[PDB]
Amino acid sequence: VVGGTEAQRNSWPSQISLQYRSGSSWAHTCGGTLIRQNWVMTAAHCVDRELTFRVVVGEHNLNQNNGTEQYVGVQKIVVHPYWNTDDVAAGYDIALLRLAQSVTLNSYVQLGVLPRAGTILANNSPCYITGWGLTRTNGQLAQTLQQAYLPTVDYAICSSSSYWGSTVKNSMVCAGGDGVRSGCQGDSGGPLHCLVNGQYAVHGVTSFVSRLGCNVTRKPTVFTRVSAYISWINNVIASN
Numbered sequence: 001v002v003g004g005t006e007a008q009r010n011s012w013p014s015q016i017s018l019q020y021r022s023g024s025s026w027a028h029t030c031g032g033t034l035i036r037q038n039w040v041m042t043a044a045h046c047v048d049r050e051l052t053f054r055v056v057v058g059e060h061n062l063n064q065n066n067g068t069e070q071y072v073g074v075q076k077i078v079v080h081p082y083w084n085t086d087d088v089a090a091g092y093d094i095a096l097l098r099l100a101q102s103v104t105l106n107s108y109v110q111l112g113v114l115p116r117a118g119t120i121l122a123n124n125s126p127c128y129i130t131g132w133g134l135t136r137t138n139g140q141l142a143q144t145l146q147q148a149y150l151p152t153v154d155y156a157i158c159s160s161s162s163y164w165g166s167t168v169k170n171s172m173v174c175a176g177g178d179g180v181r182s183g184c185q186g187d188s189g190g191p192l193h194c195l196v197n198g199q200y201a202v203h204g205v206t207s208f209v210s211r212l213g214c215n216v217t218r219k220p221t222v223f224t225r226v227s228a229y230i231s232w233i234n235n236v237i238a239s240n
């Protein structure tokens with residue numbers, strides 16, 4: 001996350017780190033949200049390359065044992081039938097991963113709360129972007145989980161020629177754009193947590209940023225709106 005602060009260990013306990021086996025060890029590639037003891041939600045452009053992946057639930061510092069982490073394998077990857085690699089602007093950036101084993105829930109590992117299908121947020125709704133993503137444009141990954149206050153930008157404003165234009169679809173949530181704070185490479189797939197009904201629900205799956213950089217004035221971070229995929233999410237968990 002660009003322009004972020006460190007989070008406290010118990011802060012966002014449905015946050016996961018998607019890592020791939022990079023020879024001898026494992027490296028962080030993306031975030032995700034734990035949605036079943038055995039299921040994760042991430043972005044489709046993260047699992048595009050056929051690598052060996054692992055999920056780390058209950059992570060905080062990437063580089064240090066925190067004595068709270070659960071390392072689980074991915075036994076099946078389910079990416080949306082319409083994802084097209086080459087067109088992240090089309091939407092459908094969402095994948096579901098069935099984990100090799102069911103995680104143990106505690107104060108550090110908990111399930112992410114999903115919205116009600118069809119829910120659209122008012123402009124400037126309070127949301128937070130979480131992740132291990134670069135802290136500057138062409139920067140390096142954070143060692144600790146970062147959080148940034150990224151309030152939404154509604155779809156009339158975000159598809160303004162001034163902003164992203166027609167690059168953003170109504171199946172996407174836009175948040176930030178102040179040129180200070182944003183999501184960055186390595187945050188992709190991760191949650192956008194918005195306060196609704198005194199509850200934090202994961203309303204985005206971080207999708208992309210501006211090619212000119214991560215924190216650009218009038219370029220907010222774009223998220224896959226979760227509430228548009230509720231009935232696909234359910235149907236996949238149900239048939240597995």
Ligand SMILES: C[C@H](NC(=O)[C@H](CCCC[NH3+])NC(=O)C(F)(F)F)C(=O)Nc1ccc(C(F)(F)F)cc1
Nearest residue numbers: 045088089167184185187188206207208209210211
């Ligand atoms: C450097 C930047 N990377 C990204 O935004 C990638 C998504 C990659 C899809 C490409 N296979 N994701 C992220 O970095 C995330 F952190 F922001 F979520 C970029 O490529 N973004 C980008 C690409 C295309 C368009 C579009 F085609 F829509 F015009 C918009 C943004």
